[PDB]
Design a protein around this ligand. Structure first.
Ligand SMILES: Nc1ncnc2c1ncn2[C@@H]1O[C@H](CSCC[C@H](N)C(=O)O)[C@@H](O)[C@H]1O
Length: 263
């Protein structure tokens, strides 16, 4: 039938070890999206290209977990000690590395505009869940739900959090903000993810910020003459037509943080 090519192609690429460590609904999404365009044939070659174009850079947690096992073994007021371990963990990836020397006041700065929330949602969280000594101290004692695309990374975060005896409110899982049903949060975090979304699906960043329900959302961008496209102003120009309001524009470290609210 019509719905059988999708389930067959989705399973045919999810079976291949090249594309098995990613969220199946994403493959289910790009196959259903590329179905009307291209003919029934070439679909696998068209989805494996789209996956390579968009999600090809996030396909293992083995090396990461052993990297984190070293950090928690190399160490002998204790609240400050647990930070210096999370900070060394937050330095493994370039994503959360530059945010160091800013995690000390990042959640304080954000909560000055939004208030201490009851729950934080982190889309494409990556290593950001390990910033829990900073937002729990900032007042956020609710449930933290961070999700990402690569399975192996989420497994590495899950096991490392239990080894740290982190609060059981710090939940990690796998998910895609473009294919999972619309969520609801007291504070949605899109740290260095908005521009990534517009590559995977055209004009999807503003769509997610409009479809998702949140009291407040924080969308961040890097800062880094004139040989790289400036995408911060691109986002500032994207919000002219929407009913989304910029409540505050925080510049911390090498990053710009936009606190967006729809009321
Ligand atoms: N559609 C999507 N839904 C959720 N996470 C996604 C995604 N597309 C990419 N990601 C993830 O988003 C992350 C972008 S890098 C930035 C990670 C983190 N927000 C930080 O600021 O350090 C990667 O982990 C990537 O795999």
């Amino acid at each position: 039938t019509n719905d059988n090519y999708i389930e067959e192609v989705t399973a045919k690429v999810l079976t291949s070890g090249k594309y098995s460590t990613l969220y199946p609904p994403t493959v289910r999404r790009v196959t259903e999206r590329l179905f009307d365009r291209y003919p029934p044939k070439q679909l696998e070659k068209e989805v494996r290209k789209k996956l390579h174009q968009a999600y090809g850079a996030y396909i293992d947690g083995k090396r990461l977990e052993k990297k984190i096992e070293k950090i928690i073994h190399e160490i002998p007021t204790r609240t400050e000690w647990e930070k210096e371990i999370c900070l060394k963990i937050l330095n493994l990836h370039t994503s959360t590395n530059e945010r160091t020397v800013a995690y000390d006041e990042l959640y304080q700065k954000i909560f000055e505009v939004t208030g201490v929330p009851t729950s934080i949602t982190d889309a494409g969280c990556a290593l950001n869940p390990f910033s829990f000594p900073f937002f729990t101290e900032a007042g956020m004692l609710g449930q933290y739900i961070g999700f990402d695309l690569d399975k192996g990374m989420i497994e590495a975060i899950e096991h490392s959090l239990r080894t740290l005896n982190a609060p059981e409110g710090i939940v990690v899982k796998q998910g895609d903000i473009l294919s999972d049903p619309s969520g609801e949060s007291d504070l949605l975090l899109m740290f260095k993810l908005y521009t990534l979304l517009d590559r995977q699906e055209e004009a999807s960043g503003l769509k997610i910020l409009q479809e998702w329900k949140y009291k407040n959302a924080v969308i961040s961008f890097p800062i880094k003459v004139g040989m790289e496209e400036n995408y911060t102003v691109k986002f500032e120009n994207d919000l002219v037509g929407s009913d989304l309001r910029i409540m505050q524009k925080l510049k911390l470290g090498n990053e710009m943080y936009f606190i967006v609210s729809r009321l």
